[PDB]
Amino acid sequence: MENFQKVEKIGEGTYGVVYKARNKLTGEVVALKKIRVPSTAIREISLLKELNHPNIVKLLDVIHTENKLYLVFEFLHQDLKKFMDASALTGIPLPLIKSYLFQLLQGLAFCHSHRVLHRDLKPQNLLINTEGAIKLADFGLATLWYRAPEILLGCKYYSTAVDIWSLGCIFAEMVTRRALFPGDSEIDQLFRIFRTLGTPDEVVWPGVTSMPDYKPSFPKWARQDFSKVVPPLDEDGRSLLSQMLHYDPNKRISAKAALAHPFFQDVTKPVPHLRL
Ligand SMILES: Brc1cnc2c(NCc3cncnc3)cc(-c3ccccc3)cn12
Missing domain, CATH: 1.10.510.10 (Transferase(Phosphotransferase) domain 1)
Structure with a gap:
């Protein structure tokens, strides 16, 4: 998570809050969802990462660290x-x-x-x-x-x-x-x-x-x-x-x-x- 600089909260998802954030490294602006870990959840979420389509928000990365789970999505305005x-x-x-x-x-x-x-x-x-x-x-x-x-x-x-x-x-x-x-x-x-x-x-x-x-x-x-x-x-x-x-x-x-x-x-x- 230290690789991300929060810009602002953009809502309260069902599991965690969603923030607009900047990838301190790539410079990428993304939506960061903090969930809020069951192995089944980890595996299931990992499969969603491969489900790519023009009309589905891209799940860029899944970060499981500190027993915490963050989902990094492409950002829409x-x-x-x-x-x-x-x-x-x-x-x-x-x-x-x-x-x-x-x-x-x-x-x-x-x-x-x-x-x-x-x-x-x-x-x-x-x-x-x-x-x-x-x-x-x-x-x-x-x-x-x-x-x-x-x-x-x-x-x-x-x-x-x-x-x-x-x-x-x-x-x-x-x-x-x-x-x-x-x-x-x-x-x-x-x-x-x-x-x-x-x-x-x-x-x-x-x-x-x-x-x-x-x-x-x-x-x-x-x-x-x-x-x-x-x-x-x-x-x-x-x-x-x-x-x-x-x-x-x-x-x-x-x-x-x-x-x-x-x-x-x-x-x-x-x-x-x-x-x-
Ligand atoms: Br992934 C994801 C990627 N972009 C958004 C996004 N962008 C719209 C927005 C941008 N700036 C400020 N407010 C909203 C909102 C939510 C969301 C927000 C609330 C509930 C569910 C999803 C999820 N997002």
């Missing part, structure tokens, strides 16, 4: 949460929303093909640069707003589909400029989802009633139309969103399939206006 707040008056242009969604799906498709899940996607961990790129941060390391219903209902062996759900929630949020399901407790999160998408049943989600935390006593709400949920998103966008928000994880669209959706027929790569 802004995150999507800040960008969304900055764009709150006018909203992010549709072409940029589409480009970002497309890139994130490419990132997920890659991770998922390698059997790596994110599990905790949220705007704060989607990082952007001046070139119009967006990257997933914290993939494989593992607010309730983005949590998939199967996680809330106590499924222990959830799948890659949880990331598609989180990303669909983020897509909606970019479009409307409001969080889709801003729950403040696990039950409030679940019920917010039910109020909008309808209380799930065996018809739309076989096996739902046998899940660990399902209760027959859950209120039965009817489903709302997406036209009410994400105006003014066009029919291609609404159709994709609906697929990303399917209750049954086995029915939910995969990242790979989503990339082929008609919504992306006219995708481009615009450059955002960033104030750093």
Whole structure:
């Protein structure tokens, strides 16, 4: 760690704090995550080091010293949460929303093909640069707003589909400029989802009633139309969103399939206006 000069804290990760730092030697500016060691964690983290893709934040180095664990990542200047707040008056242009969604799906498709899940996607961990790129941060390391219903209902062996759900929630949020399901407790999160998408049943989600935390006593709400949920998103966008928000994880669209959706027929790569 003495090889690094901390510049400033850039947030509080799930395991440790993240700092912008300078490699006293190389001169490199990086993001340093201090975790906060199990041999299994060491080995697992080491494998993530080989998982390289344009839309995944590069894990540069893993430093286990003093029985301490630091993760050195490439540094990006802004995150999507800040960008969304900055764009709150006018909203992010549709072409940029589409480009970002497309890139994130490419990132997920890659991770998922390698059997790596994110599990905790949220705007704060989607990082952007001046070139119009967006990257997933914290993939494989593992607010309730983005949590998939199967996680809330106590499924222990959830799948890659949880990331598609989180990303669909983020897509909606970019479009409307409001969080889709801003729950403040696990039950409030679940019920917010039910109020909008309808209380799930065996018809739309076989096996739902046998899940660990399902209760027959859950209120039965009817489903709302997406036209009410994400105006003014066009029919291609609404159709994709609906697929990303399917209750049954086995029915939910995969990242790979989503990339082929008609919504992306006219995708481009615009450059955002960033104030750093
Ligand atoms: Br790896 C990594 C590489 N760059 C970031 C980064 N940069 C955005 C930023 C830059 N300067 C100041 N504030 C934010 C934020 C977070 C992060 C922050 C909070 C939670 C999760 C991830 C992780 N990062």
